[PDB]
Amino acid sequence: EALKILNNIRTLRAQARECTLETLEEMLEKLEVVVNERREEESA
Amino acid sequence: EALKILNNIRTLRAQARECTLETLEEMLEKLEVVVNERREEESA
Amino acid sequence: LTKTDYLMRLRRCQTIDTLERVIEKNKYELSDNELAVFYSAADHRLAELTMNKLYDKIPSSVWKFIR
């Protein structure tokens, strides 16, 4: 449900309006390492 | 509500198994640019 | 369905403005389940059209030009 609206930049912009810059940056870093983990397994 | 569970690496890494790296990457690249826009605003 | 299918169907629309009309209408036709890949198709189509260069994969820095 949440990953649905996350696939579109327009909808994403609206939800990112209720979160401070800090939270956005923090969550980005958290997602980054998660994708990195998957990428690692995907390439290994 | 739809962001709280995203701030936890435990749930994030769990729900990240719902889709393949394909969809994850396409949406990831869409998120990083959004955060940048917010950065530009907070910097302005 | 695959996002490639929708991409080819949406690639028939040009001027960008025409694309905004079809996605607006289909928005009330889709059952939300296919909307997931439809979003990717629309975003993908807009990205290639904005940069004026068709690419299989869309570079991350291109999503910044999407309105």
UniProtKB/Swiss-Prot annotation, chains A, B:
The UniProt disruption phenotype note reads: Decreased growth below 30 degrees Celsius. Altered expression of a number of genes. Derepression of the cryptic blg operon. Alteration of chromosome organization. Double hns-stpA mutants grow slower and have reduced viable cell counts compared to single hns mutants in MC1029 and MC4100 backgrounds. In 0.3M NaCl a double hns-stpA deletion up-regulates 583 and down-regulates 86 genes, 363 of which are thought to have been horizontally acquired; 131 are also up-regulated in a double cnu-hha deletion. At 28 degrees Celsius csgD transcription is reduced.
Q: Which residues form a coiled coil?
A: 20-44
Marked site (Interacts with Hha) residue numbers: 10
After translation, how is this protein modified? Cells (strain MRE-600) in mid-exponential phase have three 15.5 kDa proteins with 3 different isoelectric points; the major form (H1a, pI 7.5) rises in concentration during growth while the 2 minor forms (H1b, pI about 7.2 and H1c, pI 7.0) remain approximately constant.
The subcellular localization recorded is: Cytoplasm, Nucleoid
What does the record say about induction?
Protein levels rise from about 4,000/cell in exponential phase to about 18,000/cell in late stationary phase (at protein level). Subject to transcriptional auto-repression. Induced by increased hydrostatic pressure. hns transcription can be repressed by overexpressed StpA (which is usually repressed by hns). Induced by cold shock (42 to 15 degrees Celsius) (at protein level).
Note down the stretches annotated as region Involved in dimerization. Answer: 19-44
Variant or mutagenesis effect after changing residue 28 to P: Derepression of proV and bgl expression, does not dimerize, anomalous protein mobility on gels. Protein localizes to nucleoid but no longer forms discreet compact clusters
UniProt lists the family membership as follows: Belongs to the histone-like protein H-NS family.
Subunit notes for this chain?
Answer: Homodimer, also found as tetramers or higher oligomers. Oligomerizes into higher-order complexes that form bridges between adjacent DNA helices. The N-terminal region (residues 1-64) can interact with overexpressed StpA. Forms a complex with Cnu (YdgT). The H-NS dimer forms a heterotrimeric complex with Hha in the absence of DNA; this is mediated by residues 1-46. Interacts with Hfq.
- State its role: A DNA-binding protein implicated in transcriptional repression (silencing). Also involved in bacterial chromosome organization and compaction. H-NS binds tightly to AT-rich dsDNA and inhibits transcription. Binds upstream and downstream of initiating RNA polymerase, trapping it in a loop and preventing transcription. Binds to hundreds of sites, approximately half its binding sites are in non-coding DNA, which only accounts for about 10% of the genome.
The name under which this protein is listed is DNA-binding protein H-NS
Source organism per entry reads Escherichia coli (strain K12)
Q: What is the lineage of its organism?
A: Bacteria, Pseudomonadati, Pseudomonadota, Gammaproteobacteria, Enterobacterales
UniProtKB/Swiss-Prot annotation, chain C:
The record's statement on gene disruption is:
Deletion results in a large increase in the production of extracellular and intracellular hemolysin. At low osmolarity minor changes in overall translation, at 0.4 M NaCl expression of about 25 proteins altered, including decreased OmpA, crr and AhpC (in strain 5K, not a K12 derivative). At 0.3 M NaCl in strain W3110 up-regulation of 113 genes and down-regulation of 8 genes was observed; a double cnu-hha deletion up-regulated 134 and down-regulated 5 genes, most of which are thought to have been acquired horizontally and are also up-regulated in double hns-stpA deletions.
Tell me the GO molecular function terms. Answer: DNA binding
Keywords associated with the record: Repressor, Transcription, Transcription regulation
Keyword Repressor listed? The answer is yes
Q: Does the keyword Repressor apply?
A: yes
Q: Where is this site: Interacts with H-NS?
A: 20, 43
Induction notes from the record: Expression is autoregulated. Induced during biofilm formation.
Q: Which domain of life is it from?
A: Bacteria
| GO CC list | cytosol; H-NS-Hha complex; transcription regulator complex
Q: What is one GO biological process annotated to this record?
A: regulation of DNA-templated transcription
What InterPro entries does the annotation carry?
Hemolysn_expr_modulating_HHA, HHA_sf
Outcome of substituting residue 5 to N: Does not affect H-NS binding ability
Reported impact of residue 43 to N? Abolishes the interaction with H-NS. Loss of the ability to repress the expression of the hly operon
What remark does the entry add?
Hha and TomB may form a type II toxin-antitoxin (TA) system.
Reproduce the free-text note on domains from the UniProt record.
Answer: Histidine-tagging (His-tagging) at the N-terminus does not impair interaction with H-NS, whereas His-tagging at the C-terminus does impair interaction.
The Swiss-Prot or TrEMBL record describes its family as follows: Belongs to the Hha/YmoA/Cnu family.
* Known function: Down-regulates hemolysin (hly) expression in complex with H-NS. Stimulates transposition events in vivo. Modifies the set of genes regulated by H-NS; Hha and Cnu (YdgT) increase the number of genes DNA bound by H-NS/StpA and may also modulate the oligomerization of the H-NS/StpA-complex. Binds DNA and influences DNA topology in response to environmental stimuli; does not however interact with DNA in the absence of H-NS. Involved in persister cell formation, acting downstream of mRNA interferase (toxin) MqsR.
Protein name according to UniProt: Hemolysin expression-modulating protein Hha
